[PDB]
Amino acid sequence: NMDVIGERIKRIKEEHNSTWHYDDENPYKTWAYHGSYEVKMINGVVKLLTKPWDVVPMVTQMAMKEKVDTRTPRPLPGTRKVMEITAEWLWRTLGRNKRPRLCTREEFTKKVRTNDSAKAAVEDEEFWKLVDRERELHKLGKCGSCVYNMSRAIWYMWLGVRYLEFEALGFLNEDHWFSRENSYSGVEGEGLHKLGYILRDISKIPGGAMYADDTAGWDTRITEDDLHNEEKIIQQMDPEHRQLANAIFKLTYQNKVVKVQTVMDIISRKDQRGSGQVGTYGLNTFTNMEAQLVRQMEGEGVLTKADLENPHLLEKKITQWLETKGVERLKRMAISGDDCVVKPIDDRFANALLALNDMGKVRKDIPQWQPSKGWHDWQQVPFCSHHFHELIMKDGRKLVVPCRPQDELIGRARISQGAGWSLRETACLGKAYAQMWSLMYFHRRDLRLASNAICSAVPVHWVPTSRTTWSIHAHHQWMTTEDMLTVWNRVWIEENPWMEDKTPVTTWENVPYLGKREDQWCGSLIGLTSRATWAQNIPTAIQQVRSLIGNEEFLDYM
Ligand SMILES: COc1ccc(CC(=O)O)cc1-c1cccs1
Ligand SMILES: [Zn+2]
């Protein structure tokens, strides 16, 4: 307990003698409690151009620790042996061609400069001086400020912990360990436009249905056993690298100190997965791959209830299954953190729930022992929040595109993050959403129309600033003043590995829409008179926005 986290706790309490009290009214049943201390907008452009969505409930809803505080039952001994053998095989497989390595101050500095306000932090040598400090400490087996939360110098300590984590484990993302080519099941770096093609390729594999089971609170279900298995990547590092990485796992993952928000609370726990940590996506992806392989093994009859309870379980059958079929089984899945799609060899997988429940990965909103429902159409499978619709262009070429309920897209676009933002900043974020819709959601009639209206409304030279999403699947091709059709051709034709015919598309007229029935099923307002009124009266609203923005140069895209 205290040896590992004590120093971290002492600095906060000593620094906060101004108000350090122990509350006996603290609601912490699972996390350890140490003490606490006292502490202290709609996007108008988009809203004006989407009047019909002013009513829609999902749009209004978006404008406006209960699960974290639980314990996960320890997995059984046989399960623990199976997870261990599987983790060792997977880590060796992921490391077959790549070697782990330390990440550097330069790499981290360059990432920050192109992604706030830590830019000022990385430009000051004082920041790097303290980092050299937890590092000497993180190297002797201790950390003193390496803590996380759920114009004060405390910010430097937080950013410092993140850099130290990046230095030790950033190579998983920086060297693409979870790319599809390296990991087989991974989709890191593919991007949203490619996920649909990946599911369609998965559907070609012979087998049973496609399963996409959601886990309830995945981060809260990461056990002490999962963390031990995740740490096995350490055996592949160089001694200098092994020392720092071991420090990150032992002192910040296997032990943690957190701050929650009026007053602030200091709590600690030896399990669960940290919120903002750098290795979270990669470690979650690795653990999900291991669990899904284990579920496939149970599905094939390789693992039984007796095997899960057996403390003296023999490795040979697991090693043989992994060695002869493990890569093929990995190839049947698309896994991004807690999102997974699995196409097992047959439908026995639907009822293979002993190991999955035993590892703590309990499926959300379904009785624990009810069989999973699979899909026979890859187009109905949900993954990373999306539908993947397959489309035929007028020229006969086929595209695979992503659908999501239209109210979710319009609702997000209508929200600006942060107050005190000028119209120019607001118009630019609107342009970013509009251009994102042109690139990814061009097949929705309402979004293409709203997209044309926003771009007509804002000055053509203006550069979209601010991100429309934090998703790891977003490549931000829409953050540009380059012609969107040129970008569309580059993304969907030129750089598209699934498009053999490279003939460019010269007009938006040749860029297809979803079928009218499907567009309506996915939330389109097309066919309602209110939509027709909006479409007819859109130029008037565009002129209204242009007049408020001022005398700048605009283009008509209707
Ligand atoms: C898997 O891709 C996503 C998942 C979720 C979301 C919603 C959000 O994060 O704001 C957006 C996306 C993307 C939109 C455009 C390129 S990625
Ligand atoms: Zn530390």
Author numbering: 272 to 311, 319 to 342, 355 to 405, 419 to 453, 470 to 580, 587 to 883
Cite, word for word, the article reporting this structure.
DENV NS5 (∼900 aa) is comprised of a methyltransferase (MTase) domain (∼250 aa) at the N-terminus, mainly responsible for RNA cap formation during viral replication, and an RNA-dependent RNA polymerase (RdRp) domain at the C-terminus (∼600 aa). It functions by replicating the viral genomic +RNA into uncapped –RNA, leading to the formation of a double-stranded RNA intermediate, and then using the –RNA template to synthesize new +RNA copies of the viral genome. The overall structure of the RdRp domain consists of three main subdomains known as the ‘fingers’, ‘palm’ and ‘thumb’. Being essential for viral replication and with no equivalent in host cells, DENV RdRp represents an attractive target for drug development.
